[PDB]
RNA sequence: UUCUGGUGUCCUAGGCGUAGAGGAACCACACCAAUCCAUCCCGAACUUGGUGGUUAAACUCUACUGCGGUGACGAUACUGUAGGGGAGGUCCUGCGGAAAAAUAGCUCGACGCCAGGA
RNA sequence: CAGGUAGACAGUUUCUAUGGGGCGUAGGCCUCCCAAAAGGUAACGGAGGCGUGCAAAGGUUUCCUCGGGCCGGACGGAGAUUGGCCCUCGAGUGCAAAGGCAGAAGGGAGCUUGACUGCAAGACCCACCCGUCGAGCAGGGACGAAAGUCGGCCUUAGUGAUCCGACGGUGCCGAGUGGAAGGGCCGUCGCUCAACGGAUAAAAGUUACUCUAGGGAUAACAGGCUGAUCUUCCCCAAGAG
RNA sequence: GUGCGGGCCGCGGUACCAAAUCGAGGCAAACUCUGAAUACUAGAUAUGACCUCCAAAUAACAGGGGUCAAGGUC
């Protein structure tokens, strides 16, 4: 009936992707991203590089750690791992080679039926 | 104002974050005293000092004599002795750290008569 | 056509009415008092000067103006001398009143209300309310061809004018109704 | 127009080179602002054809 | 009416009136208080009305204060106009009130003469109140 | 094993302030000179080469809880989940998780390497 | 044949979103909030900015620390310039905001052009097309005594697909053959194509003389929801009386 | 509260005028010295059911064998 009256806003940027892509006590293999952020929210440590946008990478293959870079900061670095496998005792290790067994009998008695 | 003492360790830690110590590549630093020299080669790495030179060993102090301070011919003499105490360890390659001193003067002699034979810097 | 813009164009406009309203209700009051209808006067006689040793000065610095009654006024002169001039500037200024005099005092006597005086003067009562009624009309008239101008410019939207121009009326309607009711309490003094 | 991108040559190579190595001729192209440097612009730039450093300057 | 003569922003959010204040519900100033029991929005002209009541009839020395200010604005749009287009201006102030949060304190004065008054005052708020002795 | 100086890592960041100790050696300052070098001016700083006076300043060590820093348990707020009241605003219950703030309390760093001295 | 010249005449265009449509406003990119502690997330929701700039405000080497308050001193005063003391990151970083940075990414000085060539393992992002970071290798180089650093700028906006054309280069093709025309390739340039994933090299209005295909997905009348507003009561009682 | 400067009556005095600070006490989507629960990411642990039975043919839940069901990527 009266009117009406527009406003002089609506504009906005969408989301870039920033945060953390790799979180702590996780692989991360040579060049790959751990945190893509603005400013030095995070430092760099060892065994891992920075770039232009303040993106930090990694170097080498290990597990990503957080630190404390003074009384303030923070800090990340990659440190090595061990190599230490799996038992096949595992209920993990027993289960995944039940399917290999069982998806291999299952074939055998298909073409050994008739 | 800043004093000497605090100006010169200033100007130290902007230079460490730049050398770093290593086990192919050790780090070389020196202190200068109102009276003394002194030279350290430590693998940051391993936080452990590989060899020294000092004013006040045995083998140079009855050699040279000095009244005042260590002059230009004394820094010649602590890079000849550290060398050959370097290469009989097994390390040539070495990352010269300047104290925050500046290089012209006693620490080039220094660093050119260490360079002068064996060591690779 | 921004709000801010619609703001701006509005406080611009609406300050021009609302500071040239409470003009001409300023004035039309005035116009009111000069029909004196015979209730009280300590006002009429101070605008009547007098010569006093060839000076023009006011009754006001002359004399004392009290008011025994309503419908009567006294004169008390500090100078006999000055006592003449006051009665020739009287009847000279043809205010409409027959001065007398007692030897030492002047005294006015207002007339009383009469029939043929009440039409003819609620004539002019009326007269002036219908001047004070077609002054805000003009405001009224020239405050839409504003918005109307600004329209044709392009400052402003179709949307825009019918919203100030409804809002408007509101306005001048509440100083429309200021009108009337001096009119009102004016209409009572007439009995 | 103020600022303006500026076309750089290479002062050294030549026109139908008949040489074995490479053929042609070394060009970059950069920002130059004309108030704030009314003067010419040579840089010493890499040229591939040269197998050297040169001096790059405007062609215009 | 109360309201700040500046604000870094003119327009805010509804909110949302939860919980209870574990702050505003001590007695500092004054003897006698006023202690809200329900959460509600209280404008700059509630609180003229019960300043005015409280203080109008507390002649004899009653000294007043008020714990509260309302630094939140409310918007209202144009009078009979559709939905979108922006939001409304600003219309008057509000303070946001939860249960515990002292409105009035009282001094100089006798309890009862503060229960005659604060009554009153609580007569305008548009909630349930209780009176405190400290 | 300790003392001095040099040089680090860890770290609760370990400092301010107050009160003491240190000069044989070590560190530092003070004093004098100036064309290797230096001052948008200045040997203050920076660099050479000299005299050894002084622990005054700095620095090192010893102590404390006055600032500062650090900081709970418990309880409560809040909350996941399954449900239940109230016109609404919003509130309650069971199972599980669980603070901030404040207070008690802790804190005047921990551990290495080289040279010299005992 | 060419130039100019009448909607006299013909063929056509005249965007969309939209708490109905229109008048208005907006159209792409960046930053904060709404966004609910990964990321992402709408509204005609709240705040503001971009369509660049720098030949140093880039690179490298190296030395410094701003700001505020108090006190002293001619013109000089709250405030210019100068000395000292105290708090310590409260300044500044070309511009909006956020994040980051104190012996610094801020502020000076000296030399310089890596504001390179030929690449690139592996990742982030994600309908598609786009976009982002990047160890490391060769080449030839700048700074630095050296170790080492540099593939534009503290970071995020400063931008436009394709077709076509233009300039320069080129050891490619060359309609029988040799040439040439022309074209390809490499390097780069040309649109406020801003309605900004751009329908054409090139386009505005009116219809109440009107017409068709559809829609209660969408307005006007009424019903219904809501009850701001309107109407009718109640609560407190400062005062009038 | 202290009251910078001054207005007030004032050659300098005082009730009343506010530029900072102290104490007490509040608020905030676009403030944070602090900071959950859930969620997200990754890793680790673990017997799904039934039948036939090694033994006993009680118990213990104990083995072997067999069957069935069930999650995702390209
Ligand atoms: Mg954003
Ligand atoms: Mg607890
Ligand atoms: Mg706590
Ligand atoms: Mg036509
Ligand atoms: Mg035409
Ligand atoms: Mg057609
Ligand atoms: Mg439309
Ligand atoms: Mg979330
Ligand atoms: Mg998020
Ligand atoms: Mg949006
Ligand atoms: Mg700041
Ligand atoms: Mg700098
Ligand atoms: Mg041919
Ligand atoms: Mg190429
Ligand atoms: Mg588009
Ligand atoms: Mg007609
Ligand atoms: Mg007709
Ligand atoms: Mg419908
Ligand atoms: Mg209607
Ligand atoms: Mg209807
Ligand atoms: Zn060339």
Same mark, same amino acid.
């Given at each position: ?7 002089? #806003? ?7 992707? %920033? ?96 | ?9 200033? *100007? ?34 391993? $936080? ?74 | ?93 043809? %205010? ?43 405001? *009224? *008239? ?50 | ?31 130059? #602002? ?27 | 009416?109360?309201?700040?003569? *500046? ?75 559709? $939905? ?51």
């Amino acid at each position: 009936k009266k009117g009406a009256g527009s406003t002089k #806003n609506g504009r906005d940027s969408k989301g870039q992707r %920033l945060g953390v892509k790799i979180y702590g006590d996780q692989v991360a293999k040579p060049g790959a991203i751990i945190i893509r952020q603005r400013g030095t929210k995070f430092h760099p440590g060892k065994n891992v590089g920075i770039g232009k946008d303040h993106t930090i990478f990694a170097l080498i293959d290990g597990l990503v750690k957080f630190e404390k870079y003074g009384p303030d900061k923070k800090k990340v670095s990659v440190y090595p791992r061990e190599i230490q496998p799996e038992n096949p005792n595992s209920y993990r290790a027993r289960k995944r080679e039940n399917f290999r067994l069982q998806r291999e009998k299952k074939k055998a008695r298909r073409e050994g039926y008739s | 104002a800043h004093t000497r003492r605090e100006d010169r360790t200033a *100007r130290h830690v902007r230079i460490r974050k730049k050398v770093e110590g290593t086990p192919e590549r050790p780090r070389l630093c020196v202190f200068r005293s109102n009276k003394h020299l002194y030279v350290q080669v430590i693998d940051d790495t391993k $936080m452990h000092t590989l060899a020294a030179a000092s004013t006040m060993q045995k083998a140079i102090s009855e050699n040279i004599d000095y009244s005042a301070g260590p002059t230009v011919e004394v820094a010649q003499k602590i890079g000849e002795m550290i060398a050959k105490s370097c290469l009989e360890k097994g390390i040539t390659k070495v990352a010269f750290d300047r104290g925050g001193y500046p290089y012209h003067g006693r620490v080039k002699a220094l660093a050119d008569a260490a360079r002068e034979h064996g060591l690779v810097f | 056509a921004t709000m801010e813009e619609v703001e701006a164009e509005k406080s611009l406009i609406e300050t021009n009415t609302k500071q040239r309203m409470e003009k001409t209700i300023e004035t039309i009051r005035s116009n009111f008092n000069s029909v004196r209808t015979n209730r009280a006067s300590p006002t009429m006689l101070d605008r009547i000067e007098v010569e006093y040793y060839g000076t023009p000065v006011s009754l006001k610095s002359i004399a004392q103006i009290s008011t025994p009654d309503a419908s009567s006024l006294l004169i008390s002169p500090y100078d006999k001398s000055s006592l003449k001039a006051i009665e020739k500037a009287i009847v000279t200024s043809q %205010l409409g009143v027959s001065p007398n005099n007692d030897g030492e005092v002047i005294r006015l006597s207002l007339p009383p209300l009469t029939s043929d005086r009440r039409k003819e003067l609620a004539k002019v009562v009326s007269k002036l309310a219908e001047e004070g009624k077609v002054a805000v009309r003009n405001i *009224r *008239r020239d405050a839409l061809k504003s918005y109307e101008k600004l329209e044709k410019e392009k400052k402003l939207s179709e949307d825009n004018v019918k919203d100030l121009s409804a809002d408007l009326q509101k306005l001048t309607d509440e100083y429309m109704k200021k009108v009337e009711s001096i009119y009102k309490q004016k209409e009572q003094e007439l009995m | 127009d103020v600022r303006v991108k500026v076309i750089l040559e290479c002062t050294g190579c030549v026109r139908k080179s008949v040489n074995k190595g490479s053929r042609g001729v070394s060009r970059y192209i950069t920002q130059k #602002n004309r108030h704030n440097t009314p003067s010419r612009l040579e840089l010493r730039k890499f040229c591939p054809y040269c197998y050297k450093h040169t001096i790059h300057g405007e062609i215009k | 009416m109360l309201s700040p003569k *500046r604000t870094r922003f003119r327009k805010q959010h509804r909110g949302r009136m939860k919980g209870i204040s574990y702050r505003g519900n001590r007695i500092c100033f004054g003897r006698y208080a006023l202690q809200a029991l329900e959460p509600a929005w209280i404008t700059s002209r509630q609180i003229e009305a019960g300043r005015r009541a409280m203080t109008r009839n507390a002649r004899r020395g009653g000294k007043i204060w008020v714990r509260i200010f309302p630094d939140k604005p409310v918007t209202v749009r144009p009078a009979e106009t559709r $939905m979108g287009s922006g939001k409304g201006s600003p219309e008057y102030w509000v303070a946001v009130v939860k249960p515990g949060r002292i409105l009035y304190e009282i001094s100089g004065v006798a309890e009862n003469i503060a229960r005659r008054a604060v009554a009153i005052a609580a007569s305008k708020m548009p909630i349930r109140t209780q009176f405190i002795i400290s």
